[PDB]
Amino acid sequence: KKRQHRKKQ
Amino acid sequence: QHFEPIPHCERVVINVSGLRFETQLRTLNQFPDTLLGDPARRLRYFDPLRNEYFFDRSRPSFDAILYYYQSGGRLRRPVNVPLDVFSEEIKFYELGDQAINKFREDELFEYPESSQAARVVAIISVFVILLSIVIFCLETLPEFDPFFLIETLCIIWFTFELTVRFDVMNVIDIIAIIPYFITLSLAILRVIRLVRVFRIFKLSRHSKGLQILGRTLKASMRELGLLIFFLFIGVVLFSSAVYFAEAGSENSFFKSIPDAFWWAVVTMTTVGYGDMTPVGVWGKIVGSLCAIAGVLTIALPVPVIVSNFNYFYHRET
Amino acid sequence: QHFEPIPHCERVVINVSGLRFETQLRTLNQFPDTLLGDPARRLRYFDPLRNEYFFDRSRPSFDAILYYYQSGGRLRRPVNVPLDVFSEEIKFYELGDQAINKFREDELFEYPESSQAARVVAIISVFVILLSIVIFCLETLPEFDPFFLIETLCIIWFTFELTVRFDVMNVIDIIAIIPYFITLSLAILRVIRLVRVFRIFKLSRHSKGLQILGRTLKASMRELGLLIFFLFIGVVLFSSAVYFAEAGSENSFFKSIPDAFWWAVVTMTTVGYGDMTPVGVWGKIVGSLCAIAGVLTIALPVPVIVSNFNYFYHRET
Amino acid sequence: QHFEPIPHCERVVINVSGLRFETQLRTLNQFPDTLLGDPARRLRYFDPLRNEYFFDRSRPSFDAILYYYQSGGRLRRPVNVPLDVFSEEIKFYELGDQAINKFREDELFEYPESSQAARVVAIISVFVILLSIVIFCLETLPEFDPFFLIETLCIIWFTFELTVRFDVMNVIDIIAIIPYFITLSLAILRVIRLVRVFRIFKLSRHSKGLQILGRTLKASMRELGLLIFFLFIGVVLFSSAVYFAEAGSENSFFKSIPDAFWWAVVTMTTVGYGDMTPVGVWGKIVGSLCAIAGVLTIALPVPVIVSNFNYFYHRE
Amino acid sequence: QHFEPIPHCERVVINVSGLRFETQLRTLNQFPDTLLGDPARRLRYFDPLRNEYFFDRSRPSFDAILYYYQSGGRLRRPVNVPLDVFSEEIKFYELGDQAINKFREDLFEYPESSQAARVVAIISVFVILLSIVIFCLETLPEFDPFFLIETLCIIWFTFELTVRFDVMNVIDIIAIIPYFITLSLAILRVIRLVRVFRIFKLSRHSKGLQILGRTLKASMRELGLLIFFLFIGVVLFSSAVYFAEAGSENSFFKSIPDAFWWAVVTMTTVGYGDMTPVGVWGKIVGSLCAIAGVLTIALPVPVIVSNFNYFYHRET
Amino acid sequence: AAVAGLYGLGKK
Ligand SMILES: [K+]
Ligand SMILES: [K+]
């Protein structure tokens, strides 16, 4: 979980 | 569903700062208006020497822009760039107000405001709400007119704020003052003195987190219903099992399946029933199974609500 | 395993809307049929002026299409585009029904319908199931013909529905009606009265979420077995430790190691045992270790189960 | 907000090992200094044969470099390359000390440093802290000069360390020794003998993980406050509900709503109250609802704190 | 740290199925051997008509392959392709066994079960389960017949151990040491307790148990952090609850250590049971203890969870 | 259980 993480994009 | 163009008039080349794009003119003809749709807004970018269209802008983001023409109505942001840069890219070509709006969803009266003079009004309302809650809790105490005066002052402030203001916020404001005027079979009295607690929900107007929680509940009502259904099924099953474990035993701990219902709950939620000795071996096995199944059936639905709350909380900030 | 062609007949160029691809004809001739596999379906896209194949479609998704030819049978969607674009991307070239189907796995009869006259039957069935559950839980009460008539009406409805209909749903329907006909040693009677509760599982036919839970359990049987095994190991170890901590003290709280099993359980799942005073310091240390290890062992395997539930829930919607 | 250039003098081509980039010179001259900003530092890479700029480096990472000129101040790392290659690539062109620094935020005196054989001092300090904690706990026992001597030795060591040393660490160091010197109504005495426990926080200077916990608390104070607010709302609501469910029954289990508060807590956190029999059916329903809502309100805000702690721990 | 080449002999062009790459020959000369490092293994791919290097393979994976030449020793897989294709791409160019191992790091029938030892294993599992059952049953109050089965199990265990001849062997030795010991009562109690270690022999036959052991070995640090946090919380909250109740007659807690257990069953949400004789301040301290316990358990455990998940998926 | 969290799969 990060900012603009691979899960989100 | 969208329509894609098919080949066989003339082909054109688009040079997005060295990345050459070649498409049929019919594809550019598909969407009227727009910078690239009509010659009027794109003639300035034509290069007479090279017969090419030059757009000295971001190269990786032009693929989605071309795919809009390619797919004829589909705009999806590729996962290689932040949303900030892509928002500016679509504005450059002016794809259309409807197109941009569709992608947006893809991801006195001074009281309802926040100014220098509205802040004191808000803090006064918060203090009054907290005072009303405190007076409620203390008037329920066994040690106890002095409470009635504070209660009626809070009610006058609440109704004054409601009248000045005039969804769900107004409904909560109304319900917070209905019971006071109701007082002006003891079951109805108990119900109204219970619904007096709804004044605590007036903090939603002044707390940002509480509104986030409300939005999360509204979004995940389906998951809440699924969790309640799973809990009900588990409670019924394990109550039946634990009752029939002691059915053949004398001096049964559980008189009936509904009696065991509470027990099942405090085992599915891992709260704990307390005294557990008079239960035999089979009841203990059923209890262990109930504990495991409760852990599972609580851990399954919650993460969806967790994700909804996280999304709402991070979208707020 | 897949076979990749090796170089040294003639080379051809593929132009995906400006993105030039060069590939040996032997690689293109590996796969028969298909838009590019045979000259019949790809001569229409030939450009006599430039001797090039022009494909005015999505640039980024052609890499996987060529890699399917390159690897000679290996096709995987790169993580740069959504699934909708890639699904339609393959249909353009018609790589083959078997190739597309293989990629899909990579990611009267008036009752089983949704007609206007079928929803009433479904609502009657679910109402009857709920009524049967209620009648069961009320007939088990100490305060109690009136229940037998309702039970036999529910059984008649269940048998009528089963006969009209005529996996696992049919097994559940059979089990929900076996015990009533069975009644027409006390251990067998207790077992049949217990298995009567399986009528609650008939809601799976009408509940979408319950089928999702069943599919999740079927998928994660292995993780469930792992969790049960870990629980058994922990229970045995900690029950033995806590029993041997009180071996040397008179009036031992635990008479034997099996006697302690229940305690261990309600400490691993954090349910709680209740009274804990007659336990010495070593027993308390063992209990603290048991609580920590139980938290860890119940936390370890459930991510997989909840991820499977998430996947099934999202696939359903 | 950032400003981007607009077209209409001469355009140039950049060849990043075969990936040709064509950009307007006005874009290149937007940022002074830098390898590409001035002709002095970029004439070396010019190719007279083809009039092209050759930069034999990582192709995928040049898009961010050009976009920085394109956006005129916005430099964002695309998610296609590791952090190591991007940090080295930007240093090649010397984008600017302020520019690189801005991107960094996007993602005796022997005691403080445990080097030069001073780790012995640290282990002695840890041993003294543990001994002080043990002596405190043992002196609270009913079975009990021998404790006072050890306690005052620990206090002398603590004050010697604090004085030779001379933030939150210093505040904790001072608080760990205030109560001993204070003792040289009984409510104040109870408060000081309670705050004497703050010597356990002295391990912060030596334990790396506890500093991570402190940083996580500082970062997620807002989420902790939100969790406390949710718990308070739920406790008040369910305490009122359960109390009013027992109003009409004689020998009520809960005498008042505040009395029920504690119960609500042990049902919201799923700890357990214990004896629960004298509660009627309505109270049992309220308790089940309280347990479920407590599970919900505990599970909602804890992932943020968990993520913050994980990020800090794995960054350390 | 790795070395990158610097410009000024002749530059060569690489055509990866239409994706043109241009690099300095010195960059390819940096690594000896390899398909592209030496002319012997790459002259076959030369195109005399175009003077180009043609490599009809996956285009997106050549960026990392070239970056290995570019970085002079750093090979990182970009997030655009699965790991299966990258392993095939690197094998084509034969970068080097040492280089590929970097990404790699990124009678006697008992171990290898082959048909007949597929039974021996089931007999061993059955014997282990039987020994556990005999242990638990002989601890019952109602109970030679148990000793015979115990000695048969020990005979089988020692036969297997001596035929076989890490940690599995250590556990096997421990599972039979106490039986041979029997051939102050504190030592007797200790050996009868350590007799339970026979339950760990299932590690040889259970795949999940080995995964759990590997997870513990990997996350020993996180386990220690969790234990430290729990200890700090227990000490703090036990001291607080003791001092919140010392001033009342007939105090529930006699001393801070006496409260330790309570603190534990409040941090882990197990529950203590009876809670009435504690006053308002004790109840507030207990609520704070419960909340802090939820936080301190939810903080480090997910790291161990992540380690276990990774090991479980790596096994399968 | 109050964890109810997946998070990143972990190191490599
Ligand atoms: K509990
Ligand atoms: K619990």
Residue numbers in the entry:
A (entry chain H): 12 to 20
B (entry chain D), C (entry chain C): 84 to 91, 96 to 194, 216 to 252, 277 to 298, 310 to 327, 357 to 489
D (entry chain B): 84 to 91, 96 to 194, 216 to 252, 277 to 298, 310 to 327, 357 to 488
E (entry chain A): 84 to 91, 96 to 193, 216 to 252, 277 to 298, 310 to 327, 357 to 489
F (entry chain G): 2 to 13
Could you give the paper's own sentences about this structure?
Here we investigate the mechanism of fast inactivation in the Shaker Kv channel using cryo-electron microscopy, mass spectrometry and electrophysiology. The N-terminal methionine is deleted, leaving an alanine that is acetylated and interacts with a pore-lining isoleucine residue where RNA editing regulates fast inactivation. Opening of the internal activation gate is required for fast inactivation because it enables the plug domain to block the pore and repositions gate residues to interact with and stabilize that domain.
We reconstituted purified AcA-EI Shaker into liposomes, injected those into oocytes and observed that the kinetics for the onset of inactivation were indeed faster than for the WT channel. In this case, we observed one main class (also 3.05 Å) in which the density for the N terminus within the pore was improved, making residue assignments more accurate, and we also observed an additional nearby density in the chamber corresponding to a second N-terminal peptide. The cryo-EM map for AcA-EI Shaker with additional N-terminal peptide also has continuous density between V4 and V474 and P475 in S6, and between A5 and those same two residues in the S6 of another subunit, suggesting that those interactions stabilize the inactivated state. The density for these two residues in both GT Shaker and AcA-EI Shaker with additional free peptide are relatively strong, positioning them outside the pore within the chamber, consistent with mutations at these positions altering association rate between the N terminus and the pore through long-range electrostatic interactions without altering the stability of the inactivated state20.
